[PDB]
Design a binder for this molecule. Sequence first.
Ligand SMILES: CNC(=O)[C@@H](C1CCOCC1)N(C[C@H](c1ccccc1)c1ccccn1)C(=O)c1cc(C)c(=O)n(C)c1
Length: 112
Amino acid sequence: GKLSEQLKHCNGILKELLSKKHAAYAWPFYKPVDASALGLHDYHDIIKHPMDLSTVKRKMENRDYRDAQEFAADVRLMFSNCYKYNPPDHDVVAMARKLQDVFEFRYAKMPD
Ligand SMILES: CNC(=O)[C@@H](C1CCOCC1)N(C[C@H](c1ccccc1)c1ccccn1)C(=O)c1cc(C)c(=O)n(C)c1
């Protein structure tokens, strides 16, 4: 089916985002933000829907994503949270922008 093929494309993108090739800028997005650990006591007041690649991986493994759009919405939410919370000149924002460039260019090659 088309939905199967498009979700294989998404799974390939997910595997690439988690790969050693992108680890230098992808690592901030590997696991949920631990606000308490970092003293970011405003994080959950500002970010109502946290997202990270471990959560995307769990949802893909559990067949939670019914289509590519649902997968893309979660990956883009992860970047949006980073752009919303952090000052735009912070290193983590530069790293989000680099990983989003990897995501958007490969996502755009979606099989019809
Ligand atoms: C204990 N947590 C961390 O130190 C790590 C996690 C360690 C476990 O794997 C996931 C990342 N960071 C990244 C960290 C950082 C600390 C605080 C403020 C912003 C980023 C970072 C990034 C880039 C460069 C230097 N440091 C975060 O939680 C993290 C990530 C994102 C996307 C974010 O928006 N925020 C606010 C925090």
